Amino acid sequence: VQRVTRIENLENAKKLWDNANSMLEKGNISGYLKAANELHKFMKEKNLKEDDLRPELSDKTISPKGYAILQSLWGAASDYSRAAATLTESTVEPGLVSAVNKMSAFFMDCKLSPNERATPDPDFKVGKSKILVGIMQFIKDVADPTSKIWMHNTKALMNHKIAAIQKLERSNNVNDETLESVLSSKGENLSEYLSYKYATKDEGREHRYTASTENFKNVKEKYQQMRGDALKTEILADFKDKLAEATDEQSLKQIVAELKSKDEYRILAKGQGLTTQLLGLKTSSVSSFEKMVEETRESIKSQERQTIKI
Ligand SMILES: CCCC(=O)OC[C@H](COP(=O)(O)O[C@H]1[C@H](O)[C@@H](O)[C@H](OP(=O)(O)O)[C@@H](O)[C@H]1O)OC(=O)CCC
Ligand code: NA
């Protein structure tokens, strides 16, 4: 490796480090992690270590605010990677969160020598629930859109947990216990996950008009042999995953219109009992869908308030 190549690689690494620090300074957790991930990868690709870059950062500073955020992130990620390692699933979610600790540590060690101590602003109070949401946003950003944590789409499960944390915030009910329950969850309680009391994979309730695909010409093949509450469950699970693709209000509107145009939606809206059909009642599953739509809308609004701040 020529000197000119090393110089060019270190100058690009410095720029990557600076991008991460810039995000950190703005309190943009997901942006910081995206930047930190790229710094780390690039350095590894160029066989450059923390000791190689550190001399180049002598004109740079991690602020006291920055160190406070790094400390909170470390603790939050450590806790989350432990909480997310469960009998249901212990590979994907902990692996993702553990990578956050590794890349963030690397960013810091590029600046700080092994024996020098971080200097956090002792009065800068970092919100653990904000940090956790930031980690989840990062996971959403890095995940393949078809990847799963246990039986659930990773991006949908992240939206689920982000929304759950946001609800705790709005209810001022954020503490270790309530956060632990969200972090350790894999959506095992399917009725909670889908906001549908009757969520099931088995025969579910007996009905006069058990749901089926038989009166519907354009339903996807995967549903054709499903019936009843199990059929509605599967449709709701797939609709949930589709909703989690929304990025802003306009994309949500579009996705919702597309879903409602489907025979799958008509199945949800068709009553399985005489009273629902006779009196023209909204079904439980339509209400579940609307609840997920509204939660997605509010979560979008909430995170877009946050983009303005970061
Ligand atoms: C108008 C206010 C009262 C009311 O909501 O009644 C609905 C209730 C339940 O309606 P239904 O029997 O139609 O059962 C509902 C139907 O199976 C819906 O399709 C279900 O939603 P889905 O799971 O989305 O299919 C509802 O869960 C059922 O309750 O009716 C009775 O209990 C009368 C019993 C003689
Ligand atoms: Na039946």
Side-chain angles (χ1 to χ4, degrees):
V1 175
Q2 293 148 53
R3 180 174 315 275
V4 65
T5 303
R6 178 179 174 84
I7 289 172
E8 287 162 359
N9 290 334
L10 286 173
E11 277 321 282
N12 284 327
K14 185 173 177 165
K15 289 185 183 163
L16 295 178
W17 187 95
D18 197 76
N19 291 353
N21 198 37
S22 173
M23 288 288 182
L24 185 60
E25 192 60 30
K26 291 182 178 202
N28 187 339
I29 304 305
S30 65
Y32 162 72
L33 295 172
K34 183 171 207 297
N37 191 20
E38 188 51 41
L39 172 65
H40 193 209
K41 195 182 192 189
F42 179 79
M43 294 277 284
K44 285 190 292 177
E45 289 165 348
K46 298 309 192 179
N47 198 15
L48 295 171
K49 289 166 79 183
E50 301 96 318
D51 286 353
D52 294 300
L53 184 56
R54 197 173 308 105
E56 308 302 321
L57 304 182
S58 63
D59 60 336
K60 302 288 165 180
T61 173
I62 296 172
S63 67
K65 179 188 170 187
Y67 282 122
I69 294 167
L70 294 166
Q71 181 60 28
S72 306
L73 182 63
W74 178 268
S78 299
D79 289 346
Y80 183 6
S81 73
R82 171 182 36 70
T86 84
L87 289 170
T88 302
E89 196 290 289
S90 55
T91 294
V92 175
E93 205 174 5
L96 287 163
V97 178
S98 285
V100 164
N101 265 332
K102 188 174 183 54
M103 69 183 68
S104 197
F106 187 86
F107 166 81
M108 202 180 83
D109 290 342
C110 283
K111 173 62 201 176
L112 207 60
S113 277
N115 295 0
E116 299 168 354
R117 289 175 304 170
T119 54
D121 178 349
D123 305 314
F124 194 78
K125 307 298 181 199
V126 188
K128 189 140 94 86
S129 68
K130 318 312 286 144
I131 294 305
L132 291 165
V133 169
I135 295 171
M136 299 171 181
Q137 289 168 326
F138 169 75
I139 289 171
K140 274 180 66 169
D141 292 341
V142 301
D144 181 278
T146 70
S147 62
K148 292 180 183 295
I149 287 164
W150 186 51
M151 286 171 188
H152 298 320
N153 183 77
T154 295
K155 299 178 92 175
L157 181 65
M158 289 306 97
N159 274 17
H160 196 76
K161 297 192 181 198
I162 290 165
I165 288 170
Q166 287 170 339
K167 186 166 189 167
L168 294 172
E169 291 177 337
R170 290 193 309 272
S171 298
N172 49 62
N173 188 28
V174 179
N175 54 66
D176 286 351
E177 181 171 311
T178 62
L179 288 177
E180 186 81 7
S181 306
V182 177
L183 305 181
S184 74
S185 184
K186 312 295 175 166
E188 291 95 331
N189 180 338
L190 202 61
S191 74
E192 196 278 332
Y193 190 66
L194 299 183
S195 300
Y196 180 54
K197 286 167 55 181
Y198 315 102
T200 190
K201 273 114 150 58
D202 304 335
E203 310 95 325
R205 293 167 296 173
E206 301 190 24
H207 294 293
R208 172 66 177 92
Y209 305 111
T210 295
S212 95
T213 60
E214 214 200 307
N215 301 149
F216 303 87
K217 285 84 218 293
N218 294 112
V219 175
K220 291 151 220 141
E221 179 178 336
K222 66 164 291 185
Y223 304 116
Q224 293 296 343
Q225 298 299 328
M226 297 175 185
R227 287 179 77 219
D229 298 341
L231 168 57
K232 297 198 178 195
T233 298
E234 193 75 7
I235 293 166
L236 281 171
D238 290 340
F239 282 16
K240 190 176 178 71
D241 290 345
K242 187 80 187 168
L243 294 174
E245 297 176 14
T247 49
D248 57 10
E249 175 61 30
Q250 184 49 56
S251 58
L252 181 57
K253 276 198 181 78
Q254 221 136 44
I255 287 166
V256 173
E258 172 70 354
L259 294 175
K260 290 183 65 166
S261 75
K262 301 174 162 295
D263 285 353
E264 284 82 353
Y265 182 84
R266 296 173 182 97
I267 291 173
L268 295 190
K270 182 169 64 160
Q272 303 185 263
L274 184 52
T275 300
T276 293
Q277 293 200 1
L278 191 67
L279 303 187
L281 303 185
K282 179 178 284 180
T283 60
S284 299
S285 55
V286 165
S287 292
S288 305
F289 177 63
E290 292 174 356
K291 182 168 181 279
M292 291 190 311
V293 170
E294 284 313 303
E295 288 187 353
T296 304
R297 175 158 287 126
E298 291 304 307
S299 204
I300 285 168
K301 288 191 189 169
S302 191
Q303 304 168 244
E304 246 139 60
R305 286 201 289 276
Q306 200 61 21
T307 309
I308 296 157
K309 313 184 75 164
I310 69 192

